[PDB]
Amino acid sequence: NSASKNSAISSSIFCEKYKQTKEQALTFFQEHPQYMRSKEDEEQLMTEFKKVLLEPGSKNLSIYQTLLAAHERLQAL
């Protein structure tokens, strides 16, 4: 009954059964279609997203919340 065993069970429910991460990512891109119109904008978003995911302040945030943070950081430049 370890943290590892419980992480495996809970992550499989969230990610493999519910597929929450993929659902959230699709929601974000449906709400922000500029990222499908400009390869350059998507590259910029993926750079900001990879930076957000390095931050300990972002460690417990969802893909939706971190994509949205990446988008907002692009807008605030």
Which residues contact a second copy (rule: CB under 8 A)? 1-11, 13-15, 18, 20-30, 33, 35-39, 42, 46, 49-50, 53, 59-67
Spatial distance between the Cα atoms of 25 and 46, rounded to a whole number of angstroms: 12
Query: Which member of 9, 38, 43, 72 binds Na ion (CB under 5 A)?
Result: 38
Query: What is the smallest separation between the CB atom of 76 and a second copy, expressed in angstroms?
Result: 20
Query: What is the smallest separation between the CB atom of 7 and a second copy, expressed in angstroms?
Result: 4
